[PDB]
């Protein structure tokens, strides 16, 4: 119904450090004929579920160094790929990707798999979407690991959540230009620029899902939804603030990638004040936007903060 295409499996033959088996769902309510891929690691009967949400322009491959740390602690780890990315199917029209299209996929997934005692792990788009989830069914969420991300509220309510869009020029302006303009977008080159510590092999794992441009409509729309927030996004993100501030009673762990020009200190300090009981953030000095590429340390530390409370 939604015209989509699927990445050929051979594209993922030679992945580096990604020995996780695939799981797929193609029966989601509202998502007819669309197949979603997701990792399901560690003990499936575990009490604790770590739900790892990726952002722009990556996939579950992003959490590859984190997954094993969480699985080794005795937690089941779920890492889905959004429609348009990684091993999931990719709608071909940019108009098909909306804030609600991606948000409703997540609620559907959560319900379909019946996840409970969830430790939400977010970053970038994983957080813009992810942070609006608990208020829809609060009994399923218990903890939060927040890396560089915020809420897509209107500019008046939270100016810090809108300011990074225009300044600095080598920040979100540069990122968006790099993503929406090339007619021949090479994700491996983009990734090596924005995550300078990646090896050649790691960089190509991020280009793997996209043989050509026809596969990159969701990649292209994400940055535009940051710049042009529709009303449902604004209303839902505005309503999530109240939830974080007054309603949330779980545990939180925050890590900030200090070299991030998009969502660094001036976006995440303000986020820290809105999350009831959020503690002092772990500042990672050598980390950029993709904190996850210094993921083992964050996972290790997060588990240690959480255990010092059980
Ligand atoms: Cl983006």
Swiss-Prot record:
GO biological process terms on file: 1,2-dichloroethane catabolic process; response to toxic substance
Active site (UniProt): 124, 260, 289
Temperature dependence: Optimum temperature is 37 degrees Celsius.
pH profile: Optimum pH is 8.2.
Keywords: Detoxification, Hydrolase
Record GO terms (molecular function): epoxide hydrolase activity; haloalkane dehalogenase activity
Control of this protein's activity: Inhibited by thiol reagents such as p-chloromercuribenzoate and iodoacetamide.
Domain of life where this protein originates: Bacteria
Pfam families on file: Abhydrolase_1
Pathway(s) this gene product operates in, as recorded in its UniProt entry: Xenobiotic degradation; 1,2-dichloroethane degradation; glycolate from 1,2-dichloroethane: step 1/4
Binding site for chloride: 125, 175
Residue span, AB hydrolase-1 domain: 49-295
SUPFAM superfamilies with a match to the protein in the record: alpha/beta-Hydrolases (SSF53474)
Record InterPro entries: AB_hydrolase_1, AB_hydrolase_fold, Epox_hydrolase-like, Haloalkane_dehalogenase, Haloalkane_dehalogenase_1
EC number: 3.8.1.5
Family label: Belongs to the haloalkane dehalogenase family. Type 1 subfamily.
Function description: Catalyzes hydrolytic cleavage of carbon-halogen bonds in halogenated aliphatic compounds, leading to the formation of the corresponding primary alcohols, halide ions and protons. Has a broad substrate specificity, which includes terminally mono- and di- chlorinated and brominated alkanes (up to C4 only). The highest activity was found with 1,2-dichloroethane, 1,3-dichloropropane, and 1,2-dibromoethane.
HAMAP family found in the cross-reference section: Haloalk_dehal_type1 (MF_01230)
Subunit structure: Monomer.
Name listed for the protein in its UniProt record: Haloalkane dehalogenase
Species annotation: Xanthobacter autotrophicus
Name of the gene this protein is made from: dhlA
């Amino acid at each position: 119904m939604i015209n989509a295409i699927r990445t050929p499996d051979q594209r993922f033959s030679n992945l580096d450090q990604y020995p996780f088996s695939p799981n797929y769902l193609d029966d989601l309510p509202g998502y007819p004929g669309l197949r979603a891929h997701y990792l399901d690691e560690g003990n499936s009967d575990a009490e604790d579920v770590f739900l790892c949400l990726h952002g722009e322009p990556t996939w579950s491959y992003l959490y590859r160094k984190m997954i094993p740390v969480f699985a080794e602690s005795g937690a089941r780890v779920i890492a889905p790929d959004f429609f348009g990315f990684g091993k999931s199917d990719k709608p071909v029209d940019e108009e098909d990707y909306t804030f609600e299209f991606h948000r409703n996929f997540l609620l559907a997934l959560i319900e379909r798999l019946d996840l409970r005692n969830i430790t939400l792990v977010v970053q970038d788009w994983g957080g813009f979407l992810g942070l609006t989830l608990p208020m829809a069914d609060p009994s399923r969420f218990k903890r939060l690991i927040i890396m560089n991300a915020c809420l897509m509220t209107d500019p008046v309510t939270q100016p810090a959540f809108s300011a990074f869009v225009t300044q600095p020029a080598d920040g979100f302006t540069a990122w968006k230009y790099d993503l929406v303009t090339p007619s021949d977008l090479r994700l491996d080159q983009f990734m090596k620029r924005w995550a300078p510590t990646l090896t050649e092999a790691e960089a190509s794992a991020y280009a793997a899902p996209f043989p050509d441009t026809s596969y990159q409509a969701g990649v292209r729309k994400f940055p535009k939804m940051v710049a042009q927030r529709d009303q449902a996004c604004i209303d839902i993100s505005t309503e999530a603030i109240s939830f974080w501030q007054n309603d949330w009673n779980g545990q939180t762990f925050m890590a900030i990638g200090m070299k991030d020009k998009l969502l660094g200190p001036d976006v995440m300090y303000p986020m820290k004040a809105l999350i009831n009981g959020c503690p002092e953030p772990l500042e990672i000095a050598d980390a950029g936007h993709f904190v996850q590429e210094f993921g083992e340390q964050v996972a290790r530390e997060a588990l240690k903060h959480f255990a010092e409370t059980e």
